[PDB]
Design a protein around this ligand. Sequence first.
Ligand SMILES: CCS(=O)(=O)N[C@H](Cc1c[nH]c2ccccc12)C(=O)N[C@@H](CCC(N)=O)C(=O)NCc1ccc(C(=N)N)cc1
Ligand SMILES: *[C@@H]1O[C@H](CO)[C@@H](O)[C@H](O)[C@H]1O
Ligand SMILES: *[C@@H]1O[C@@H](C)[C@@H](O)[C@@H](O)[C@@H]1O
Ligand SMILES: [Ca+2]
Ligand SMILES: [Ca+2]
Ligand SMILES: [Ca+2]
Ligand SMILES: [Ca+2]
Ligand SMILES: [Ca+2]
Ligand SMILES: [Ca+2]
Ligand SMILES: [Ca+2]
Ligand SMILES: [Ca+2]
Ligand SMILES: [Ca+2]
Lengths: 191, 142, 254
Amino acid sequence: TVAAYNLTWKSTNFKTILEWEPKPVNQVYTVQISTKSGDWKSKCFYTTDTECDLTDEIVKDVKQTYLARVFSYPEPLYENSPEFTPYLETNLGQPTIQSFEQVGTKVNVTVEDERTLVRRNNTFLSLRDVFGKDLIYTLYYWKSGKKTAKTNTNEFLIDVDKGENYCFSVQAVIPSRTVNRKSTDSPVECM
Amino acid sequence: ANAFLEELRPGSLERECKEEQCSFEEAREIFKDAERTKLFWISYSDGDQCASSPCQNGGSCKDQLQSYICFCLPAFEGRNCETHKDDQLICVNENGGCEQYCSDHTGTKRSCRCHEGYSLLADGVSCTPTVEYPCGKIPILE
Amino acid sequence: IVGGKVCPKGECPWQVLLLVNGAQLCGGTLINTIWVVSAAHCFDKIKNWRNLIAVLGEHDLSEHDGDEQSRRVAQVIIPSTYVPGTTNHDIALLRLHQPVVLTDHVVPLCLPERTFSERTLAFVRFSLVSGWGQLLDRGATALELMVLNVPRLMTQDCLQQSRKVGDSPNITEYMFCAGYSDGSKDSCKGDSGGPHATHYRGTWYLTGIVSWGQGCATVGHFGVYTRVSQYIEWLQKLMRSEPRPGVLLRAPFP
Ligand SMILES: CCS(=O)(=O)N[C@H](Cc1c[nH]c2ccccc12)C(=O)N[C@@H](CCC(N)=O)C(=O)NCc1ccc(C(=N)N)cc1
Ligand SMILES: *[C@@H]1O[C@H](CO)[C@@H](O)[C@H](O)[C@H]1O
Ligand SMILES: *[C@@H]1O[C@@H](C)[C@@H](O)[C@@H](O)[C@@H]1O
Ligand SMILES: [Ca+2]
Ligand SMILES: [Ca+2]
Ligand SMILES: [Ca+2]
Ligand SMILES: [Ca+2]
Ligand SMILES: [Ca+2]
Ligand SMILES: [Ca+2]
Ligand SMILES: [Ca+2]
Ligand SMILES: [Ca+2]
Ligand SMILES: [Ca+2]
């Protein structure tokens, strides 16, 4: 057997999957995950895949720091993964502009409060529910010249020239973050 | 899309990209600017990866740029919700729910056992002491 | 024990005190009314094999109470593969001359089955180590039984997370590391033979034996314990065997 390598975390809106190499040849894998003071819990028992979904485990406490390791079978050979702190590292999914209504010389741009994988009382919590004040949305628009706006909610209230048409795009952002601070730009929408 | 003479009319996002599929060039004629056209084209032409209906067992697919995300029903997990949480009753998995010893059984279900001085309860997973001072228990705390 | 606390009287009921010629020798673990598991190296320099005593229900070495029970050690079984002065196969099975009385202060720790221990217990993060050993490396021993909660590590991580030393003993498959490398908490020499007990779903099990390490609570090093799971068969077969003429017995291993 060969120890797995290049263990990488693929997480978006908390959907978290551990991937690694190489494509198993005469060897199966079993994953274990835990917090620095918790017990090791096994996942994806004897899988031949080179991936393992750990979503249900990390959403139990997205602020904890997790460590995972992949065992290799023909103590067994294994490899530790990089530490992973969901709250600080899960990528923000691509946003979606839910709507925008014009009211005279102003426009209200609403951003869809998309859901995450974090369960709570038999429901999925939104990005807002999870990040609260840590989350803001930035707007990048233009009179159909660059313009930008920021909000600590899911809506932008901006001024516009009567008659002219504008196009909008937003991004999810967690200012305090160091890495993966911004989501990709949302689809463009025009009035 | 382009039809006979339509290109004589000014560009229109609604008529060209919404009510029809517009090429990059048609999109470029509407947005004019380079960056703007690109900002629009990345999403417009990405394609809905949820079209395959990859999320199994009643899960819900959420489209993303060149990828998707599956939200699963409580009893499921996995990239595409293909994992049956109820089909993991094996000994290596949380000791199979057994309070003490676990024995696997290919073809059937694992069975639980107990250490000397204990007996397996009717639930088939728990162990209760059959002596006054079983091993591993602390009297002044029991 | 370095950096631990007193084990409230009665909360470490399987802890054993071993004495030779009335002098403190080592710790040990009761696993039934007649057998005690300890460390083999605790007997490297024994001369009067007839003066080995095991005391159960001990707590405060400066005060006698009715929970104490003394028994002569009628037999010390050590693997034929253990070499005095070294570290591998550091385990010993002791037969008490007379069974001890099980009370609220004297209870045996459970010897688990092999696969349960390797597959489940070995992955329980924390376990308890205890003894009347030194409170500091090279310091004085404790008067009251001390206990310490230590985290376990797979050997690969132990090696990677430890300061490589010149001629340190190898960490074999008959061992496992547990503790901290910041020099704050660990078991020590006088704790040898004592239990490394793991709590799992309402019951405590014997997973390790205080064996060795570089000094005590040394920065960049972890405590090393005998991996009891490897001796389950060995122990069970011997507990069913007939007593021998002499005290010391070397039994083959496997
Ligand atoms: C450094 C001498 S030492 O500190 O006494 N360590 C030696 C191993 C040892 C020998 N040479 C070495 C070189 C580098 C690192 C370790 C060693 C060592 O530990 N030797 C054994 C006796 C060997 C025998 N059969 O007589 C010993 O002292 N065991 C008691 C003990 C219990 C717990 C801990 C602990 N948790 N901490 C440490 C020690
Ligand atoms: C649906 O489309 C996605 C695109 O990435 C593909 O990965 C799935 O396998 C398919 O079901
Ligand atoms: C999407 O989410 C999944 C979990 C199920 O609740 C579906 O019914 C829903 O459409
Ligand atoms: Ca057209
Ligand atoms: Ca056209
Ligand atoms: Ca056109
Ligand atoms: Ca229309
Ligand atoms: Ca048309
Ligand atoms: Ca053109
Ligand atoms: Ca054209
Ligand atoms: Ca897409
Ligand atoms: Ca006393």
